[PDB]
Design a protein around this nucleic acid. Structure first.
Ligand code: C5P
Lengths: 147, 158
RNA sequence: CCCCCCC
């Protein structure tokens, strides 16, 4: 059972991270969702979500190694994903502002595909700007182009 | 914080051992104590697959092991994780950028800004270009955008 | 325009 496996695995790490952490794992469409509550959560998240991503990444890998490909897993704490999407929706809305004036394209910072997706999605059918990614790997980033 | 040898060694052995079992049963683990720091190497199994895309996996294991060591003992013991000469090949890539910067800067007489870099990586740049007869180094900026600038020992007149 | 490779 993928849920029970994640519970034992993520429960193992959570104990070493903070005894106040508690875990809920649920499926929501195609996506396995792991929510952490309790204790100093910012310490769990870490600077720029660095700790939460390391857990999420490793959780994904041990999940793939036992059950195979096709799973989507997202790990979250105290609505940190929302805030990160909102901040991403901002700055992108800011990009369409700058590119609107200056007819010169604008290069956004590198982002993983899930975050580039959000940029593409917000600026969908924007009257002034389009989006298209560039570069490869950790280099890859969205470019805001003018019409 | 407690002595590196003893519990911190055994703690990391058991923690990484459990993680490596799920990643690949072929993995074995050597954990070395260097003074009051810890060093850990993963051997066996598919090491390419352990490292993962652009090293994301080895790095997430390193980061997380550091964090849980700090939670357990109060320090990360400057833990450094390696596999299949990963750390060495990345030390070389950083050295390459600094080399190409040295050449360009000594020619143009203009400073060049290297890509932003963690302090660990910034040290490698500084050390490689110490006592370099044509260029020098000095960092600039704050936070994630702190990066080494390579300066010509003798500036362009202009 | 997921993300881990079984890339
Ligand atoms: N000339 C230099 C400059 C920095 N360093 C090292 O590089 C690290 C990064 O410092 P910067 O902020 O100067 O890049 C320092 O913490 C120090 O260990 C060095 O070893 N020699």
């Amino acid at each position: 059972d993928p849920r029970a496996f994640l519970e034992e695995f993520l429960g193992g790490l959570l104990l070493l991270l903070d005894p106040g952490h508690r875990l809920e794992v649920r499926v929501e469409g195609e996506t396995l969702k792991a929510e952490v509550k309790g204790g100093d959560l910012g310490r769990f998240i870490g600077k720029e979500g660095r700790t939460l991503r390391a857990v999420e990444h490793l959780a994904r890998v041990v999940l793939a190694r036992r059950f195979g490909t096709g799973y989507r897993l997202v790990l979250d704490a105290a609505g940190y994903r929302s805030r990160a999407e909102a901040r991403i929706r901002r700055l992108a809305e800011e990009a369409a502002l700058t590119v609107a004036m200056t007819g010169e394209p604008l290069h956004l910072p590198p982002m993983p595909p899930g975050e580039r997706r959000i940029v593409h999605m917000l600026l969908k059918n924007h009257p002034r700007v389009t989006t298209e990614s560039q570069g490869e790997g950790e280099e890859r980033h969205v470019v805001v182009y003018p019409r």
